[PDB]
Homo-oligomer: A and B are copies of this chain.
Amino acid sequence: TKYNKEFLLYLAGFVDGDGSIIAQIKPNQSYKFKHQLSLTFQVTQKTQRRWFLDKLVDEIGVGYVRDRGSVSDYILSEIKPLHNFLTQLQPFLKLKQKQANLVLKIIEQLPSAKESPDKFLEVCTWVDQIAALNDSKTRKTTSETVRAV
């Protein structure tokens, strides 16, 4: 699905302000290298304005709204739809464009990263770069912690 340009321009601005482009390395035993690579695009907002987030679900056509008390979040983690959405939002981002590029880069190498432990490690390096660009304050698992395999 191809999004409206004016919608993407406005959303890019809103994302640069209240959105988050997240890449995580989740320790999980059921996964090959004992870790799951997780990529998330989200937009946070006061629950009293949940209608704005619900609107994103309709406009983007995928994802959902999570409720966490007085705050809610629009969340999109499905890989294929994420790649399609971010590819279209990337040209308009100003503060988080680098993060969007790294996420797209990661997505495009996910298949081949699920083979070589070295390849996976490299991709985890890209995840570190995203965290370094965001205002990260509580990160634990890094490519270093993953190197313990």
Copies of this protein in the assembly total 2
Q: Which residue of B lies closest to A12 (CB)?
A: B10
CA distance A15 to B14 in the complex (A): 7
Interface of A, helix, strand, loop or mixed by DSSP:
helix
Annotate A48-61 by CB proximity to B: 1 below 8 A, 0 otherwise: 01001000000000
Minimum distance in angstroms from A119 CB to a CB of chain B: 33
- Find A9's partner among B13, B15, B49, B52 (CB 8 Å cutoff): B13
Q: Range of interface residues on chain A? A: 10 to 19
CB distance from A72 to the nearest CB of B (A): 14
Beta-carbon contact of B17 and A13 below 8 Å: yes
Q: How close is A45's CB to chain B, nearest CB, in angstroms?
A: 8
